[PDB]
């Protein structure tokens, strides 16, 4: 397997911070973060917005730097990392939930491209799905190299064309002064808002090691996560709020259409989805490879076929389902981190032989974290991450050995 799905990335295949910075910005530069940014924008004061977006994405940035640090220290995908805490076969459970929801998001994302475009152009929505997902599936066959190519192309155009569009929109609106006078008629609960920020990428963010395992230097992995999730996801949130405030449209590609920038709009839509969806498919192949021992390349292509032929169905009904399953993903992150923090020395080698088949305490910890998210007050994802990590740190030394 060229994606090294079954063991540590060897020294000659490692990559530098530049490629991994763009790959990860390619993940967060995504329309759904713009949409959520418009919700936060219309439901919060100008100060509350930047406080919620900055606090939330910094929490995201710290959570993902840990995972990226561990991914890079070891050269292991999230799924191989999970073998330490969940067991060799126990990890199939996180791997399927993480991988499956990403196949979900991929199909969703194919529809997010083909639907606006076929409406704007009259072209058959079905035909566009076929062509979009097929193109996106072919590129994932070529692995971390393809993700590097797409995002070093996509990310500059999105940041720069998108930023210019934000500038126009605040200018034509009366400038910053007008923007900071807009008032929500029904302000959003601040803690709900934090959950929406963190919740925009905690699922893909829990698979950070699948990409930054390629980094030679663990400290650089921390920089990648912060640049991508603190700075990058914030920028996407600002795009969405600016578009909501100036025009009632939270996707910057709707703003550009409003401004007569039709070609920038379609290009920015296609580039932001293609990068996020390729990451999704890539990580899902790694995840299903941990389960089946098959080539992650082959599985990624299979995942893209299924995701394409089911795109609309996933866009419609299965989004509430995709959000539901995903509630088990944050605790899985806290367990992995906590197990590394507790048992660093264990991670010195990738040694199948000292590993468990299944650690029931890991599964028990995930359930507890889910309960902590559903009951405890505060920020649901943070409570759900800390639920799994704290209860694992308590019960694993006791009930495992
Ligand atoms: C040849 C040119 C073709 C280019 C056509 C492509 C441009 C289309 C851009 C995306 C298509 C529509 O995108 C649409 O944006 C609105 C923003 O109000 C999103 O709405 C979103 O923002 C609101 C707040 O505004 C949030 O409460 C919520 O998270 C979400 O529903 C819609 O969920 C999405 O359907
Ligand atoms: N593929 C994804 C899109 C949006 N958010 C995620 O967490 N993952
Ligand atoms: Na993207």
Residue numbers in the entry: 4 to 404
Lines from the paper:
CodB is a cytosine transporter from the Nucleobase‐Cation‐Symport‐1 (NCS1) transporter family, a member of the widespread LeuT superfamily. Members of the family are responsible for transporting nucleobases and related molecules into cells, often as components of salvage pathways. We show that CodB carries out the sodium‐dependent uptake of cytosine and can bind 5‐fluorocytosine. The overall 12‐TM helix topology is very similar to Mhp1: TM1‐TM5 are related to TM6‐TM10 by a pseudo 2‐fold axis and intertwine to form the bundle and hash motifs.
CodB was purified and crystallised in the presence of cytosine using the lipidic cubic phase (LCP) method (Caffrey & Cherezov, 2009) and the structure was determined and refined at 2.4 Å to an Rfactor of 20.1% and a corresponding Rfree of 24.6% with excellent density. CodB crystallises as a monomer with two molecules in the asymmetric unit orientated oppositely with respect to the membrane plane. Both molecules adopt an outward‐open conformation (and EV2) with cytosine bound in a solvent accessible polar pocket and density consistent with a Na+ ion observed in the conserved Na2 site. The cytosine substrate is found at the interface of the hash‐motif and the 4‐helix bundle, sandwiched between two aromatic residues, Trp108 of TM3 of the hash domain and Phe204 of TM6 of the bundle domain in a face‐to‐face pi stacking arrangement. The cytosine forms two direct hydrogen bonds to the main chain at either side of the breakpoint of TM6 of the bundle domain: to the carbonyl oxygen of Ser203 of TM6a and to the main chain nitrogen atom of Ala207 of TM6b. In terms of interactions with the hash motif, as well as stacking with Trp108, there is a hydrogen bond from the cytosine to the amino oxygen of Gln105 of TM3 and a potential water‐mediated hydrogen bond to Asn280 of TM8. The sodium ion is coordinated by the main chain carbonyl oxygens of Gly29 and Phe32 at the breakpoint of TM1 of the bundle domain and the main chain carbonyl oxygen of Asn275 and the hydroxyl oxygens of Thr278 and Thr279 from TM8 of the hash domain in a square pyramidal arrangement. In an unusual interaction that is not seen in other Na+‐coupled LeuT members, the side chain of Asn275 is also within hydrogen‐bond distance of the side chain hydroxyl and the amide nitrogen of Ser34 at the C‐terminus of TM1b, providing a further link between the hash and bundle domains when sodium binds. Between EL4 and the tip of TM3, TM10 and TM1 there is non‐protein density, which we have tentatively modelled as DDM and monoolein respectively. Although TM10 in CodB is one residue shorter than in Mhp1, given that the temperature factors are high for TM10 and the helix retains the proline on TM10 around which TM10 swivels it seems likely that the lipid‐like molecules that we observe in the density are preventing the conformation adopted in the substrate‐bound form of Mhp1 rather than a substantial difference in mechanism.
